[model samples]
Target: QWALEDFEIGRPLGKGKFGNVYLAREKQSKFILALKVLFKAQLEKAGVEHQLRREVEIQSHLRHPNILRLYGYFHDATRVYLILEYAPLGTVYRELQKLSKFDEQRTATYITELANALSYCHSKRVIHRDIKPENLLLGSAGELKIADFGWGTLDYLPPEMIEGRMHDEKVDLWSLGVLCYEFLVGKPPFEANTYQETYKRISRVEFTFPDFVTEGARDLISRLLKHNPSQRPMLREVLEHPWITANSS
Candidate 1:
C-alpha cells in the first residue's frame, strides 16, 4: 500500500490531457518509480473513468520483460495515481525522431522482443489494441517495451476493428507489422496526408518497402499486414522468422 506522502517527487516525466507523469521514489525503500497522476474531474468529464480502471486491471496482471510494469494504483478525492516501473531510456519514438530510422539489427531485435511479449499477452487473453512508436518505451539496455493501450489508431487499425466487426488478438499482429514498417522506414506504411487516405490505405492493406529493406524483412511484413486478420501470421511465427532470429541476440 502506497500513498502520496510515501514518495519523494522529482522532475516531470511527461504530460497528458488529464494529468502528468512524475519521477518518484519511495521514501522507505528508496525504490524509484514512475507515478502517473490522473485528474479526477477530467476523467469524469471525459467519461473515461472505466477506461482508466480497465488499463490498471489489464496492466497490473501482466508480467513480461518487454511490457511496462504497473505495480499498483491509489486514489484520492480529486485524483488517481498509478505506480509504474520506470524505463530509464524513455520512449523509442524520441530516439527514432533523432535518427530518422533504425538499422536492420536494431529494428529486428526490437521486433523479436515485442513478438515474445505479445505472445505472452495473447496467452493471457490480453489484446494490445495500440502498438505505435509513441507507446513503446526503451530501457537502459535499449530494450523495447510496450507502454500504452488506451485505444488504437485509425491508421494502424486492422479491418475488423475499423469495420466494427468481432476480432481477436490478430489485430495486434497487424499493428506489429505497421510498427515494423515504421521502425525501418521512419514512417508508417499506410501513412498519408489525410486521415481518410490513411484509413483507406490500411483497409486496402497496401504498402511497399523501400529497396533498403531486406527481402527477409519484407517477407515478414507481408505476412503480418495481410488484409484478413486470420491471414496474419501468429506471433510464434513472427518470432521464428529469419529476419527476427538472425539478429535476435
Candidate 2:
C-alpha cells in the first residue's frame, strides 16, 4: 500500500541470491520492516521471473505464525522491493553456526515449529522443496519460521533428487529427517567428506546415529530417512511422534 517514498531506508540487512535486504521504517506507521530489493533482470536472467512471482503469491498468502510475513511488494521499472516482517534474531543457521549444536530441547522445539509450518504449507499445496537450517528464520523470541519458500544444500537433498529420479513432496520428508539429525548432532546425517561421497551416502541412505541422541528421535530420524518415499512419515505423523510430542512443550 506504500511506495518507496513513504519509507526511510537504513543499513542493509543481508545479501541474498537475488537481492539485498535492508532495515527500513515506514514514515507513517513508524514501524520497522525489512525491505528486500531484487533486480528484475536477475530473475529474468535466471529464468525464474515467474517462479519469483509464484513464491511471492505463496509467501504473501500464508498466514501461519511460523511463516515469515511478506507484507507487500512494489516495483519500479527494473527493481522490485518487498516489505517483510523484520525478524531480529535472523536465521537459525546463524545461531547453529555459532553454537555448533543445539541441545535436545531446543532441537525438539524448533523441529515442532517446522513440522507445524510445513504441514500448514502442504495444506495449501505449497511444498517447500528446500528444508535446511539456512532456510529457517528465527524471531525475536527464538521461534522458528519458514523463511524462503524454495536449490538447497547437498546435505539436505533427498536421494530421489540426487539420483536424477522423479520426485514428489516426500523430498521434504527426507530433508526434515536430515534437519532433525543435524539439530541433535550439529551436522547433517549424510554429510560426507565430499560432494561425490555425499551423493553416494544419500543414494544408499547410509547414516548412523550417535549414542547421545534419544531413542525416540533416533527412530523418528530413521523412519524419515527411508530410501522409499512412501516409507517416510507424513508431517502429521511427525508432529504426533513421541520425540516431538514429548519435547515440543
Candidate 3:
C-alpha cells in the first residue's frame, strides 16, 4: 500500500497488451500523469521484461518535446508501473481508422513534424524503427510524440533491415515513406497476395503510387524508399522536400 499510495489512481484510460493505463495524480504534490500498469506475470510469460526495460530506457532518457517521455517507473511484486507524460488525445491510428480521406496538407504536415522528431532521435543514436500511427500519440497541444521502442513493425522495414544485416536510421526513413503512402493512398506499398512476395517486392524496393499521389509526394516517397539506405534522404532533406515544405506551410 505504501508504494502505490503515494499516488492516487483515477479512471481507466485504456487497456494495453499486458495491462491497463489509467489517469492518475501524484497526491503528495498534486501532479498528473498517465499511469501505465503492466503485469509482471504477462511480461515474464511473454519474456519481454528486457524489451520493457528497453522501451523504458529509450523513452525515459530522451528530452525532445515530440518524443514520448517516460516520466518515471517502478515495479512491485505483481506489476511494473510507468508514469507517462499524459497525451490527452488518442493514438494517430484511431484518427486514420475514423476518416477515409487525408488531404496532402495534413498528412504532409504531420510527416514533417515527425521528421523533426526522428531527426532528434537519430542525433541521440535512437532509431524508432517503427514509425507507424499505432506507435504515435498526440500531445495536449496536438503535437505528435513518437512512442514505443519494442520490436518494430516488420512489414515496413527497409530492405537492409529485413533481408540483410546493417541497420541504421534509414530504416525509419523507409517506414516514413510507407506511412506517408498509406495515408495518401490507403495501403502499404510492396503489398502482394502472399507474405513472401511482399517481402520480395520490399527487398527489390519496388513500389507504385496511386493516381492521386501528387508528383511532389511521388518524388519524396520514391526517394525515401530506396533499397540502399545510403541513398535515402536525410530527415532535413525530407523536411525540405517540396511536398512537405509546401503543404506544411
Candidate 4:
C-alpha cells in the first residue's frame, strides 16, 4: 500500500466529494501521473460500490484517444488507487470559471472533440451519464479525453430506458447536451439547491434554454435532450448535423 509520503506533487490537481486528485511523480517510474486514490468505505457507505465496480470494469477495457488513459489500479486494504494521465491545464469547468466566459467558437471546438469521443463510446455500447466540462480534461498537446464513466455504461440496456434502468448508449447524447449547455451558459440548466429537487426536475424533464443560442445549436440540443429515448439521434446522425457539417463559425 502506498502512503501519502509516496507522492510528491508538482501540483495539486483538484478535490471532489470522494477524494482529491494530485499530479505526482512516482519514484520508480520517475514519471508524472494523476493518482485518483478513492476510499472504499466512502463508496460502500454511499451505496455506490456497484458503480465503482462498474467504473473499474469500463476503464479496464475502454481505450480511445479522446478518453483518459488509465495505466491501471491497486487495491489496498482500505482503498483503491487509479493511475491516470495528468491533464496539467485542468478541467474545462475550472478554465471556464477562471475566464468567466468562452466564445461560441471555443465551445464549439470542445463540442466537436467531445462528440467524437461520445460517438466512439456509443459504437462500443457504453453510456457516459455524466458528460460535463468538469469531466473533460486537456491532456498533453491539448487533446480532449473523456473522464468519469462511473455513472455510465454498466446500465446500458435494450428496448426501453426506464429511470435507473439500463439501456442503450443514447444516454450519452443527452449528457452531451447537458455539457454543451454548460459551455454555452456557464452552468447546468436543470440544477436545484438540493439533490431531491434536482432529481425531481430531471424526472420531469424540466430543462429550459436561453434564447441567445443559435437556432441550429438549439435544434441539435433539443433533439439530444428529448424525453423519449428512442427519439434521440444516434451518434452518427449527431455528427452529421448541418451545423457540424459546415463546422459553422
Per TM-score, the best of the predicted structures is 1
Candidate 3 residue lDDT tens string, 1-249: 235777899988767576788889998889888888888888888888787687677677789887778888888888888888877887887877888546898789779878888888888787754667777888887777777656523567777867868888888899889888877876778767877777888988888887888999999989888888899998989987877888984
Q: List the global CA lDDT of all models.
A: 0.85, 0.85, 0.80, 0.70
Q: On a 0 to 100 scale, what is the lDDT of residue 195 in model 4?
A: 60
Off by over 4 Å in 4: 1-10, 41-51, 152-166, 194-204
**Each model's TM-score, in the order given?**
0.95, 0.93, 0.90, 0.80
- The TM-score, computed over Cα atoms with residue i paired to residue i, of candidate 4 is 0.80
Q: Name the regions of candidate 2 deviating beyond 4 angstroms.
A: 149-152
Steric clashes per prediction: 0, 0, 0, 3
lDDT of 1 by residue, 116-219 (tens): 88889889888754677887888889988888747425867887888788999998898889888999999999989887788788788889888899898899
Q: RMSD for all candidates, in order, please.
A: 1.4, 1.7, 2.3, 4.3
Ten contiguous residues minimizing lDDT sum, candidate 1: 147-156
Cand. 2 Cα-lDDT? 0.85
Candidate 1 vs candidate 2: which has greater lDDT? Answer: 1
| Alpha-carbon runs more than 4 Å astray in model 1 | none
Global CA lDDT of candidate 4, please? 0.70
Q: State the lDDT of candidate 4 residue by residue for 174-234, as single tens digits.
A: 7767666677777665677876566656666677877777787777778877767889888
